[PDB]
Amino acid sequence: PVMADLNGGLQFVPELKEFTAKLRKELVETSEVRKAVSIETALEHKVV
């Protein structure tokens, strides 16, 4: 029997779950704050 690792060295990044989850949090955080700050600077412009 043959066993082929076709896993791009992913085995070697530790705490793969916590790390994966951090990457998603930081992307979403960056998106959310930019969308909110966008909407609010738009409204502050409109009021003025």
Partner: protein, 132 residues
């Protein structure tokens, strides 16, 4: 709108307020000004996004930049002074007063200052923000 202050022994005792109206048609907006004392606005800061939005605003100025706002309750005790260009457009808009954090004891304590200043505006964007 007029505001008196009666003092005895160089100490305030009571405030009088009286409002007068000159019936007629008046254009002299350069002699027009209005100061209002806004209601106290409260905000529960839950998310790190909430705090990012506040730092976005020039007028939100903390004593200590690194103050941890997360899960704190801020109050905004705000006066707004305005001058008029005409019936609609304000010639200038000022909105200032202390920003306070609620402690465990329920005592509010100054941690910074609202400081907004502007020329020709159609509105006060600080009160608009705090209202919503």
């Amino acid at each position: 709108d007029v505001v008196g202050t009666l003092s005895r022994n160089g100490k305030p005792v009571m405030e009088v307020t009286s409002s007068f109206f000159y019936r007629g048609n008046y254009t002299d907006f350069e002699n027009t000004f209005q100061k209002t004392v806004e209601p106290v606005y409260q905000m529960h800061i839950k998310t790190s996004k909430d705090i990012a939005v506040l730092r976005s605003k020039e007028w939100f100025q903390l004593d200590d930049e690194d103050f941890d706002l997360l899960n704190k309750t801020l109050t905004f005790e705000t006066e707004t002074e305005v001058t008029f260009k005409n019936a609609n457009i304000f010639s200038s808009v000022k909105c200032f007063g202390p920003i306070k954090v609620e402690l465990p004891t329920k005592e509010t304590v100054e941690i910074g200052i609202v400081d907004y200043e502007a020329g020709a505006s159609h509105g006060n964007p600080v009160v608009d923000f705090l209202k919503r």
